[PDB]
């Protein structure tokens, strides 16, 4: 049901949706969005469980 | 007499070689001066094209212009500052018919698709002395064209209407015009300055070109919405350009929505070339066009996201390089190469070789040593081609140091059997023409090399009885001097990271 209510169909538009939720304004690009998501949870320096 | 043969056929080539900088200018100058037919020089990059826009003037009086590029990248986010557009489409009006003259286009605007003659021819018009054309009727015609009504007309696309007196600035011409409509008819075509505000003189007929490179009226907006709802999707948002042009206002990066406004594929502007037209090539198109298309595709896939303002496929707005190199084969081509091409027909290597290094330096007692040796041992004409007249004084005293006073000639053909000649232009690298033994010695040929050096090795006298010969047998603790820091105690070997 969440897939049905989801207005997104692939990975790249998903990253763009995450960008537009993260940062109002700033019309997203490809590298900006993928970099934001890749350092949002998968960078040893900007995200760290002890 | 000439040195090579003009080509006129479908797609044949003519290869001219051994050329070096600031000689492509004089070759294409003689091309313009010898050939009946417009010459469209297609530079490998706009930067180079700008440079050429100087040098050709320096070597010819024949009419020259560029085609103005939008100053943004492919799929960028800026309107081109419509002033530029005012130049651009103006050339597209005359490009249907121009018998002589040269137009310099880089590969970027060479491969862009342009608005068809249907739009530009249809939305252009003429105003003569004797039309019975009504005042507000002409105002509404300007409205349907898509100009802007202001009372302080200074720049392009601006018009005013005050009772009987009407003025406007056509996007094709360069000066505004005043109308003075009486009994619902044109009575005066008076050119008045943007600064004087007074009539300079009176013409009988003049032409008007529309707003900018795509229509704007409501039928066109409905067509735009139809084609958007065909190809892309819509989302209700006041920044989404679909609804944002449904509010009527044109966004910033709207010029990259060219084909939607037009209901037909856009011509690749080769239709805009006259039938008997010759192209000359510089560098190698096969690399620069391909690099531009790769950059366009990379920037597209980078920006082919953000569904708020999605984007087109480049295979409609821009040409593909295979299509470009097929459509080139309907125009004869002359390739200017800076390389020695070996031998074949339709291929002549013109001796345009490098000048020897006339470097001027005051370190030697005689500054103009190489110059005074080269010019005297030379046997043909030499021309100096100073940039500015004030810089000509920079010629006059320096050539006075070996007491040389040159002649001032306009055209390069005014060179004689042997002598010293000066002229005005912007060429930057001289050469020697072996066929007529001409010498060109530009401004930067005497001030060639930039130098950066300060000092080194002050106290490096490494044989003093105190250098210790770097023997490395010193016991630990014996004091040691380091030249940059000072005196201390040596404390042995160590290992670090």
Query: Do the Cβ atoms of B301 and A30 come within 8 Å?
Result: yes
Mutation to test the B interface, candidates A7, A20, A27, most B Cβ within 10 Å: A27
For B8, the 3-state DSSP assignment is: coil
- Return all residues near B3 (Cβ < 8 A) that are at least 6 apart: B348, B350, B435
Residue A29 to residue B308, Cβ atoms within 8 A = no
Calculate how close chain B gets to A43, using CA atoms only, in Å. Answer: 22
d(CA B347, CA B25): 19
Q: How far is A39 from chain B (nearest CA, A)?
A: 19
> Which residue is listed with tokens 């053909």?
B413
Record: contact A13-B305, CB cut-off 8 A: yes
E strand or H helix that includes residue B166: strand B165-168
Closest to B291 (Cα-Cα) out of B83, B44, B35, B494 = B44
Say whether B306 and A28 touch across the interface (CB within 8 A): yes
Cα–Cα nearest to B333, from B2, B19, B78, B42: B42
Among residues B326, B295, B336, B312, which one has the least CA distance to residue B261? Answer: B312
Q: What is the rounded CA–CA span in Å between residue B394 and residue B371?
A: 15
Closest-CA residue to A21 (of A37, A38, A45): A37
Experimental method: cryo-EM
Domain at B352-440: CATH code: 3.40.50.11140
Q: Do A29 and B306 touch (CB under 8 A)?
A: yes
Buried b (16+ CB within 10 A) or exposed e, B283-305: bebeebbbebbeebbebbeebbb
Contacts of B151 (CB under 8 A, 6+ apart): B160, B162
* Inter-chain Cβ pairs, chain A and chain B, closer than 8 A: 26
Contact call for residues B48 and B107 (beta carbons, < 8 A): no
**What end-to-end distance do the CA atoms of chain B give, in Å?**
74
How far apart (Å, rounded) are the C-alpha atoms in residues B497 and B464?
33
Using left for φ > 0, alpha for ψ between -120 and 50, and beta otherwise, residue B87 falls in alpha
C-alpha distances in Å from residue A12, one per residue of A16, B234, B327: 6, 19, 36
CB-CB under 8 Å, B303 with A29: yes
Taking the domain B118-208, which CATH number applies? 3.30.2060.10
The closest CB to that of B307, out of A13, A29, A31, belongs to: A13
Q: Are B84 and B68 in contact (CB under 8 A)?
A: yes
Question: Which residue is associated with the tokens 């087109």?
Answer: B312
Q: How far is A46 from chain B (nearest CA, A)?
A: 24
> Please, which residues have CB within 8 angstroms of residue A47's CB and are 6 or more apart in sequence?
A39, A40, A41
Q: Which of B77, B305, B308 sits opposite A12 (nearest CB)?
A: B305
CA-CA distances (angstroms) from residue B439 to A18, B298, B359, B422, B485?
A: 65, 46, 16, 11, 56
The chain A residue lying nearest B75, using CA atoms, is A29
Chain B: which residues have CB within 8 Å of chain A?
A: 77, 301-309
A30 touches B: beta carbon within 8 Å: yes
Catalogue the long-range contacts made by B340-346 (C-beta closer than 8 Å, 24 or more residues apart). Answer: B340/B17, B340/B18, B341/B15, B341/B17, B344/B15, B346/B5, B346/B7, B346/B12, B346/B13, B346/B14, B346/B15
User: In this complex, do B305 and A16 lie within 8 Å of one another by their Cβ atoms?
Assistant: yes
- To the nearest whole Å, the CA of B309 is away from the closest chain A CA by 9
């Amino acid at each position: 049901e969440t897939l049905r209510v989801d207005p997104t169909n692939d990975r790249l538009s998903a990253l763009v949706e995450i960008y537009r939720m993260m940062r109002p304004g700033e019309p997203p690009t490809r590298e900006a969005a993928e970099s934001l998501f890749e350092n949002l949870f998968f960078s040893e320096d900007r995200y760290d469980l002890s | 007499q000439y040195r090579y043969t003009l080509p006129v056929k479908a797609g044949e080539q003519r290869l001219l070689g051994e050329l070096t900088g600031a000689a492509c200018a004089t070759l294409v100058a003689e091309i313009a001066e010898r050939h009946a037919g417009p010459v469209v020089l297609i530079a490998p990059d706009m930067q180079n094209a700008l440079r050429l826009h100087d040098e050709i003037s320096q070597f010819t009086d024949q009419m020259v212009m560029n085609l103005a590029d939008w100053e943004t990248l492919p799929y960028d986010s800026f309107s081109p500052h419509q002033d530029i557009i005012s130049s651009r489409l103006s050339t597209l009006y005359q490009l249907p018919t121009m018998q002589r003259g040269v137009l310099i286009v880089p590969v970027n605007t060479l491969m862009q698709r342009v608005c068809p003659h249907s739009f530009l021819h249809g939305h252009a018009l003429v105003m003569k002395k004797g039309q019975r054309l009504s005042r507000d009727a002409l105002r509404t015609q300007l409205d349907s064209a898509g100009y802007r009504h202001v009372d302080q007309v200074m720049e392009h696309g601006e018009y005013a209407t005050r009772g009987a007196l009407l003025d406007l600035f056509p996007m094709g011409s360069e000066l505004p015009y005043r109308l003075d409509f009486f009994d619902d008819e044109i009575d005066s075509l008076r050119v008045f300055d943007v600064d004087s505000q007074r009539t300079l003189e009176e013409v009988e007929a003049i032409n008007l070109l529309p707003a900018h490179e795509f229509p704007t009226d409501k039928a066109a907006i409905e067509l735009f919405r139809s084609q958007w709802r065909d190809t892309f999707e819509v989302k209700r948002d006041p920044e989404h350009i679909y609804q944002q042009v449904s509010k009527g206002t044109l966004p910033a990066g709207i010029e990259y929505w060219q084909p939607l406004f037009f209901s037909e594929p856009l011509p690749p502007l080769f239709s805009y070339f006259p039938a008997n037209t010759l192209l000359v090539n510089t560098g190698d198109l096969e690399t620069s066009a391909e690099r531009f298309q790769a950059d366009t595709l990379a920037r597209f896939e980078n920006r082919g996201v953000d569904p708020m303002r999605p984007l087109l496929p480049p295979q409609s707005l821009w040409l593909r390089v295979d299509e470009l190199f097929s459509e080139l084969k309907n125009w004869p081509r002359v390739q200017l190469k800076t390389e020695h091409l070996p031998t074949k027909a339709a291929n002549a290597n013109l001796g345009f070789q490098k000048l020897p290094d006339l470097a001027v330096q005051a370190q030697q007692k005689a500054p103009l040593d190489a110059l005074r040796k080269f010019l005297e041992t030379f046997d043909g004409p030499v021309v100096f081609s100073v940039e500015s007249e004030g810089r000509r004084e920079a010629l006059g005293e320096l050539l006075a140091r070996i007491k040389i006073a040159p002649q001032r000639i306009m055209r390069l053909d005014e060179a004689s059997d042997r002598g010293r000649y000066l002229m005005i232009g912007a060429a930057e690298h001289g050469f020697v023409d072996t066929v007529r033994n001409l010498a060109l010695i530009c401004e930067s040929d005497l001030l060639g090399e930039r130098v950066a050096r300060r000092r080194q090795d002050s106290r490096r006298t490494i044989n003093p009885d105190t250098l210790i010969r770097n023997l490395a047998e010193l016991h630990i603790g014996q004091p040691v001097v380091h030249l940059e820091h000072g005196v201390g105690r040596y404390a042995g070997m160590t290992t670090l990271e």
